[PDB]
Design a protein around this ligand. Sequence first.
Ligand SMILES: CCCCCCCN(CCc1ccc(O[C@@](C)(CC)C(=O)O)cc1)c1nc2ccccc2o1
Lengths: 270, 270
Amino acid sequence: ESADLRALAKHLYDSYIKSFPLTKAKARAILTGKTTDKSPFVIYDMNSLMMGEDKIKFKHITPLQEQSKEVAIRIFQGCQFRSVEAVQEITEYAKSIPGFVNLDLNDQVTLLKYGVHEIIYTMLASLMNKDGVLISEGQGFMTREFLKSLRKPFGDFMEPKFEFAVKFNALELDDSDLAIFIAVIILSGDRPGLLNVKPIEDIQDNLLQALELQLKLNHPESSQLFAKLLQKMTDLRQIVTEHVQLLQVIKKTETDMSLHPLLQEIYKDL
Amino acid sequence: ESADLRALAKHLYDSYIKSFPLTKAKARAILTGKTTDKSPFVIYDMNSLMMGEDKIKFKHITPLQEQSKEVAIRIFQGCQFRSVEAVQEITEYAKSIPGFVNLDLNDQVTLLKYGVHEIIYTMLASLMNKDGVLISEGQGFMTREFLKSLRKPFGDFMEPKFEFAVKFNALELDDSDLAIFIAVIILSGDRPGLLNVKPIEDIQDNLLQALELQLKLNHPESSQLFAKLLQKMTDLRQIVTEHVQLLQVIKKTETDMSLHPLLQEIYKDL
Ligand SMILES: CCCCCCCN(CCc1ccc(O[C@@](C)(CC)C(=O)O)cc1)c1nc2ccccc2o1
């Protein structure tokens, strides 16, 4: 019954709104302007970066950074904090996916461990355009060029995310679509170490039926969007793995920079 | 209409049968299954290799193990020889996909360059089971144990394929399904260096529509088979990436000596 699939779609969309503070709808409204209510301050260099901690609420350093927690690292631990935060949000969203909390605890943990980062990059695309990315709840916007101008290692941490974002955004998905897609990503019965794969795939199949119907009704004129979106699932994997390696480089060149335990545990990955 | 889609499907199936030596239906009959007659020669150890190598359609080297071209190397070369053949067979199959030859010539070469490995591992599964892989037109069978028992470098060359195969085969696809799938793989669109992506994605869209109808008519009881198969592309991509990795290592294993020239040409890296 397509009626049950539509109900599942509403339910997941409802929990998504309740779980994530910055939706794509709000992100796009901020990025496309035509507003005076929520224009973001733009960080495109050191100066604007310095001033940035004056317009928005940031817990870092405004002045010089060379001999005092450099700008790169300063911005790195910023993402680190937001990431750890996105993990708790995604975890809260996961619990709302029918059947998720009824699964083996070890598997719930495993699904989150391998799914969180893939969800993070998928949603991060909502905050991006070819020129940059929204930061701190959308009050700021950090230019793509500025990020690429960071120190050797950090300078290329985001470039691959932008490349993925521009392609992914071309699909023109809205929040109601992403809510089901994100749920599909989580219930991947092919994650390493899964104990009971069958119950997991039974849920994903239900979610896939919901996603398919949702895309057919929401994008009547977009042929094979469903297949096209599912293929994007391969780009995420690449992003994640790619991210992991670079992370290993940081650890060796920045033995003074710390990583949050949570994030550190989720990698043992890949 | 569902008429052009069934025609497309039939067309690819025919071409697929004509282009490849052993069909999955055939390989299955031979593998786990009686079909008691002309049982394949089994390679399970060094001695069994030597015997088969001298008692089977082989064209390369002879069984000589004594500080010269170790066993593992001889097996590796055998896989390469068959791979060079598979490349030509996949190239012909590609030319039969409607619209393929009509694409920019450079794009055709690009699509084959990046899709051959994905296709090889995908079709390889048709010849694999959890205990081994059919070799030499199915005239042989090389056990999983034997392959894994090989040295540190070559021993972890086929195991990841076995794991992939095991999962992939659980989908119970047949030759008519795989024929369309392989075509989807070839008409990607995200291959680097492409010059005119539009016609490529337009063909894949047509191929995906044909694949979906095919799976729905051929596996009416298999819910969301289409979606599950598409997500398997994320597995292949990883396998392939991981494959060039071990390949780069072999390069740093065998190189020097004025022997093997022109042969290195025929192969290079594929
Ligand atoms: C799915 C629920 C909503 C999630 C919102 C995620 C916001 N985010 C995503 C992009 C990102 C950038 C950097 C990341 O790197 C790390 C190593 C964290 C330092 C990681 O998460 O593994 C990870 C993720 C991100 N947040 C920020 C803030 C400032 C600059 C860059 C940046 O990137």
